[PDB]
RNA sequence: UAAUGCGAUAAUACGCAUGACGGUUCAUUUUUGCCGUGUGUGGUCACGGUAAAACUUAAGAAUCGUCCA
RNA sequence: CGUUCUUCAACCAACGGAAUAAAGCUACGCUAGGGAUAACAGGCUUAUUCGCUCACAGAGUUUUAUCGACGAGCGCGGUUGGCACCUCGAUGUUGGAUCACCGCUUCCUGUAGCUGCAAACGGUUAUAAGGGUUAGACUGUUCGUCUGAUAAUGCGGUACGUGAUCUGAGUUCAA
RNA sequence: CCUAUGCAGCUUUAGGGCAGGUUAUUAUUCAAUAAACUACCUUUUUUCUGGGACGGACGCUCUUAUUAAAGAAACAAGAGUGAGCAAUGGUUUUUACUAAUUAUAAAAAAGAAAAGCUUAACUGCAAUACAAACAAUUAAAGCAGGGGCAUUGUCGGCAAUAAUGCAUUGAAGAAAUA
RNA sequence: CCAAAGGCAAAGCAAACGGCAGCUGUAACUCUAACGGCUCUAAGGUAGCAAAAUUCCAUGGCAUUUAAAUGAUGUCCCGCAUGAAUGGU
RNA sequence: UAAGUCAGACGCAAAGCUACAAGGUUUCGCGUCAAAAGGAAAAAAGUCCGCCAGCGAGGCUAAGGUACAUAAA
């Protein structure tokens, strides 16, 4: 009788000139209307996520066959194109975390506390838990 | 279409569940996946999910 | 499905004619500026250079398409190039073009395509 | 971009060949209409847009035809 | 016997699914609430209904005498509808008896034209609301059919007038 | 007339029970058990809705009008779906090809078909964002292990947008305790 | 008429609780169908009565009754949806 | 504020449903009412001007007015 889907956003969340940092969405499709240019990347239904820290650029193409393509580029700080903008980019990523806890305040919490220590699987961080709970270091051989 | 259990074959009780249609392929279906249990890739055999 | 495009500081490009092949190689700094070419071998330098000493039918041979390789080995191995990377469009894949890519891999450059 | 382009063995060594006429396909914002927003006794108001839709005269480019006035 | 990991299944389709499961009647009914919500009356609307003008095609056949249409516009608030604005700590139902006030879109009694108006009997238009608008058989009726007379037996509004004036045949409690 | 954390009486092949009689089985010299028949006890019998009943509907996708950011309702309108594939998945090579879906101007260094080898339709984690009352739902660079095809690129299922179900209870494989 | 679903009983019981059809062709002119064909069911409503305290079309058709008849009586009749011990006349 | 609210109404301007009807109904942009006294249009919730701490026999204006009712040609 009536009825109506769950509304999906198709669109662009950035203009020319915004900053990015690495793995923001920039373009929600249906259909590859836009294609990735540099320093960008692709997910399986199209979805276009920046790789680097610069600002969004947009630009049109005209093909062999008379078609047109259009193309997202993220540009570096500094037009710097060299292989060494990488360990720059990471040290960026770091600094925006402590920016942003200033910000927040010390009872915005960002890591859990608990009364109990969490396994450890493979050399990292693990949810799941063990048949048994037991104290570290508290035993000793035989 | 149906679920079954692909039971490894040396015997450390690992498996995993995946989806066949019995009459397009009316055999036990074999492959080769890694088992967590020894580390490396063996050879898996279907059996009943039940 | 098109792939994300990146960014190489050297790349190779061929230009196939109705006569001739054509290769350059160009370097960048980015790709908001033009690029400057370093090697500029084409099969009419070599069919006058062959004609005088072998003769050979036309520009397109396979003889002028080795000859082309060759040329263009040793202008990267002077500049001290050992790795370029190829631009794939139409006329990557003439049969003319392929033969001197395949010459120019035996011959000890490498040529990527991704 | 003549190291071009096109071809009926179509491959490119050979064939046509860059001019000139004719027909097709692509500037005082050409300046009018029209549209959008704000304001409004429903228009004697203001600004912007039309590379969304109608509408002018050229000049050039890409093929095509051609013993050429 | 208990815990963790890897996994699956049933009813949840009223599909955020749980009190394990699971149909009805009340005119014998009862309590708590609403004009937040219906039935009668008022209000808004005017599709529908009705009226007028343009249109003059077509029947009559010289006449737009008379009849009358496709189509368009405007008006009325009386027909069938739509909405849910007033009243559920209550605005008494249909028809009739009795007694009324008003409009005119005039049935009779008037005035002035036209006519396919000789006279008589008529037809149609404009204008006119003072007076009049019958007695009975059938039916709870409004309505409708019929009978004997009559100058003629008009329509509508008024809480579809009128139960602190009457009637209770119908409708609408318990048999 | 409609609305309730509604009440009561009555009815039955609506659910559950056995607590009188009858009946069946068994045991001691007025007894014990019950998917039966009668009697009795107790419980249940949605909501939306141009008033209620009757009819219809309840999850999840695509498209139309409210212009060219997103978003936006009515018992408004026009169409799909509760799957399929052991290849129709992954990856290399070739070219007189460039389609189809429920619907759709996706896509040429891309796809489809043909030929070969394969199981990444993995194990353990994850910066940062889209969305969003919450629950859940969506995309994802990157790190370690074992692999596939290439020979240094890609693979954590399928062009994309639907093919689904919390917790509880039950069951299976393995492992650690007691 | 004891089929199906129940109840009871001596494997049977309807004056226990209940049920009791449809399509189609045919006689001088016409009409009608005495008379045929087919499907299905446990069985397919027999006599009687019938515009009813039972009738939607409806104020049914005809006759009597009145100057005038949605009335009354009689009568015609597969009767939306009459009917034989929830008895028929 | 671990509060109250989850019955909304109309004007101008659009679209769906209705009959390009309704003081109808469903969304959307601005404003007013709700919770807003005072002035103008006759009375005047939603229109136009404009937001009341108190008193005063001072002055200038808004919308609207300027032969009588009724202040001002
Ligand atoms: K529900
Ligand atoms: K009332
Ligand atoms: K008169
Ligand atoms: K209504
Ligand atoms: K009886
Ligand atoms: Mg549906
Ligand atoms: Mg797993
Ligand atoms: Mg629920
Ligand atoms: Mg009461
Ligand atoms: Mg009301
Ligand atoms: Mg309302
Ligand atoms: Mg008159
Ligand atoms: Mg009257
Ligand atoms: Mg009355
Ligand atoms: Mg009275
Ligand atoms: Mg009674
Ligand atoms: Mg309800
Ligand atoms: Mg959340
Ligand atoms: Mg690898
Ligand atoms: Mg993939
Ligand atoms: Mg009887
Ligand atoms: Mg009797
Ligand atoms: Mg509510
Ligand atoms: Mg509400
Ligand atoms: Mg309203
Ligand atoms: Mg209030
Ligand atoms: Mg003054
Ligand atoms: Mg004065």
Redesign the pocket.
Known sequence: ???????????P?FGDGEIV?????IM?Q????YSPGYNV?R?????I?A?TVGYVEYSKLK???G?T?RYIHVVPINDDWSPEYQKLADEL?VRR?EVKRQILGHHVHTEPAFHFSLPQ??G?????????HKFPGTTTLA | ?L?VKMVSLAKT?Y???????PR??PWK?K????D?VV???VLFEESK?? | ???PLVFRPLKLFFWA????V?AKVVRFSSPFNEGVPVVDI?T??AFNKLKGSAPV????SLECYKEVAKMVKEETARQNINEVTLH???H??DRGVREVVRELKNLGL?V?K?
């Open positions: 009788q009536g009825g109506k889907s769950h509304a999906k956003n198709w669109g969340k940092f690495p793995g923001m969405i929600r249906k259909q590859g209307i990347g997910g399986r239904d199209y979805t996520f790789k093909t062999e066959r078609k393509r990523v975390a699987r493979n990292n961080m693990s949810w799941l838990l063990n048949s048994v | 279409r679920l009780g498996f995993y569940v995946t989806t066949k249609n397009n392929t279906l492959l080769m996946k890694f967590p580390g490396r890739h999910l039940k | 499905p098109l792939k004619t109705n006569r001739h054509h084409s009419f330098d039918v036309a520009p397109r794939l469009n139409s990557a894949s490498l990527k991704v």
